[PDB]
């Protein structure tokens, strides 16, 4: 924090002044800046990196917008009481109660969920109308827990950028292009290489600006007449914060590497409530790309291959490999208190030539990659016994990160047994152990497969008894974190007495999500974020101009 | 401007605050202890006051060495299993965790010796208490490290009451002032940003300001009983815990506008609890450190075993929060302990959180029926009572048949002594906390005996809870609370569960909360004594 006396605030103390100062150039920052600019305010976006877009650039930009205009025009109602029941059941399973006045949620979580329902659609419509985020409907994207009877609009809520690829995998690049192009068009200023590091307060404790560290190690002070709106992302890539706050000891994530939790430090001397700090948006990752800091990494949202299993270091299956990524990641952190170890800490995806040829993908974090792609993480052997030798060497390379994990002495025998058992399940279509393929979301993210006339369940096919074979290490990671200072439903960052710190706002992964540890559907990070960017810019516009 | 002034102002009257106050007073300082409750002792009063003191005087005199390199390998291996490396310069720990562990080894014994010498905490050795992971080859002093108050009962279950008696009696004798009904709510700073005192809310809702000339030392306990903080920070959604109910995380609020580093906020000292005593806020509740009964199993709502019921409490609690992402539920959220008349008569205990309790004890949580089919009807009624806390979980339609199968299977393992599913009884800690059992000449494994085919039967709901939390502002090894640049704020100190533990999610041994705490109370008081008098 920097505090200015009245004299200082009214002097030549600032190198620049705007009505609204936005911090970060991902979805939260760009949309907050656009909505602010369209209310007639002067706006600057300050970005720590040399490039715009943050994690959002990397995303597929599915965005889950309840009650949106396309789904209604398509005749698909999204009744508010039933929307609230779906999200309450998924978010707070222990406390969900359809007879309780807030469904078993706290008043804050209920109010935040209502705010997503009320505001995501008008936000989406305005961004599209102005040309900053034109969209198309994604009617076939079903919610991640659509089988729950509380979900009364099981598909229809997803939008994505109009010019996203067919697979949607580059939707984030298209969104950052449209949003940033519109923002520049619209007279929003951008300052890159500006790492915000303090909020400046006046004598009344109101936010009146920021201090940023520039790349020459000089500092600048920039005045906000109305509001400072943080959209600075999460803290996946500050390992100390990640380790000390999250509920699982993840290895990294697909978040931009500049997402280091600066707002946690900035607000440490402002009296905020840090909330939801124990949760991230979770996903499995290609382990070596996380340790190797491959900035192109995606989370493993689609675990590719039908003639493919995951095994643990014993050579046994432990999980439905097609389970929703936010839930599958948690299996990797099961704790064995007797052995003082995480038995699933790394799992090994193993596949055959059929899945290599017909399930490879450049998209959605697949470990199986097509010719010409980066395959440094793919282990290869002509035989299963050779493959285990190579898996062992790979585990040894990372010993100091994974408890000096070793394959069981019985790995080879156990893997052969596991494959024979899996192949029987693949032949009947019924995975009696882990129910792979029996929920619709398992199929949604199944990936590509070779068409087989006899195939009973599209998520499984027997692994060939002839090589070659392929493997990759899978570890647990994030998309990014989703905890931070608590806001009200208009994005105002609160003090410990639940009262706004005047002039201070936050949107997106830098503030607390109301979704706890849950991931409701594809697009469940960005759709709510656009709702709160809209509500925050609307409230920020109403602030008095201050000194 | 201040209504009272002391050299050292201590906040909280459990182990951390009383020992910090005593060590401060014995350096010649004037000292006050401010306590929020209208009684002294906090969670410490409820404890068994085992305290794990590496390299202590009794174990050495008994010929038991505790070599420092091997102590550090044991705690590093247990605390940070992914990163533990015997060839790494700090064993794979961060420099801070390594230095804090070294500080425990260096200072716990002199702290224990001085408290005993002055008469504030006389002790006896507990040589047979083995470390919780003594089978690990890194542990080269597998037993000997535990002390307990001299006059604790044979079972040690009232050691906390004895310790609070000896410590508080000594403190009053020694001229330490006490102010109860004083809820500290702010640190007062001078213009240089140094702590110079506190503000406390008194019971008449008036506020008083008290000056500290040298230091303010927080020993205010954890945040188990602020449900919002508990829910938003811990790695598991626990229902409560045996912490004193005044442990509401006030230091988290107090330091929110001081620029601290909150660390280890994701971890608590964990234990199963008798679930109804947690929901019912029975202040006498203990964590279930000893899961009583040999003719006893835990089953889930399907009527099947899912865990070794004798596993170390800090690890067993975690099984209750296994997540089933396909059904969007916690399958083990409540487990049901079921036992027969033999364990009722021969494994009951008033101590260590046992669900099986002797005649005369509070048995409100004990579900009863003369048959197993009647018992499941009663278990269902009990789960229905708490539906809004446990996801409306219900017993399986097949519960009765499944329970009969589970019992026949368990009884075969009890007959051979070999629990082929969950290895009950195969680690020494399973025996350490096994509890009492009826002597049986032919018993192969002391943790199991076949459950009778004739009633009556008994059950209790088991849920997950804490002892207390162990996250908060980061200190250095001298107890000084740090700013975000790792520099001491300062005059400001903290000790015990109100600041970050260096033990992550681990529970090294019985006494692994209090022994380290006494080390840091000593180090903090020694550093606080060296502060200049200010403001
Ligand atoms: C990794 C990933 C995530 C993802 C996804 C695919 C991948 C590969 N697909 C998604 C999808 O289709 N739908 C969805 O709902 N979520 C999806 N995700 C998650 C999503 O990408 C993120 O949740 C979202 O993009 C986060 O947006 P937000 O605006 O909160 O954050 P950001 O895009 O990371 O941008 C933050 C920016 O702030 C800058 N920053 C950081 N610190 C500072 C300071 N001190 N000063 C100035 N700027 C700062 C960062 O550099 C970054 O640019
Ligand atoms: C529940 C329990 C825990 C326990 C145990 C048995 C039971 C039933 N047995 C143990 C054992 O044998 N060995 C061991 O190592 N640990 C054991 N535990 C855990 C142990 O009890 C605790 O970790 C330890 O006692 C905590 O000590 P600490 O001094 O940190 O905390 P406290 O005893 O809870 O005292 C805190 C006091 O601070 C007061 N307070 C709180 N807020 C304020 C404010 N704002 N102002 C003033 N005072 C405040 C509390 O009221 C309390 O008295």
Author numbering:
A (entry chain AAA): 52 to 598
B (entry chain BaB): 64 to 598
List sentences quoted exactly from the publication behind this structure:
Additionally, the final product is often contaminated with side products due to over oxidation and therefore requires considerable purification efforts. CDHs belongs to the succinate dehydrogenase/fumarate reductase flavoprotein superfamily and use flavin adenine dinucleotide (FAD) as a cofactor to perform the dehydrogenation of cyclic ketones. The crystal structure of WT CDH is organised into two domains: a catalytic domain (Cd) which is situated at the ‘top’ of the enzyme when viewed in the orientation shown in Fig. 3A and an FAD binding domain (Fd) which is situated at the ‘bottom’.
To investigate substrate binding, a catalytic variant, Y195F, was generated and used to obtain a crystallographic complex with the natural substrate, cyclohexanone. The occurrence of the product rather than substrate in the “inactive” mutant may be due to residual enzymatic desaturation and modification to phenol via tautomerisation. An 11 amino acid stretch at the N terminus, that was disordered in the wild-type form, was found to be structured in the complex form. Significantly more structured waters were identified and refined in the complex form (1037 as opposed to 570).
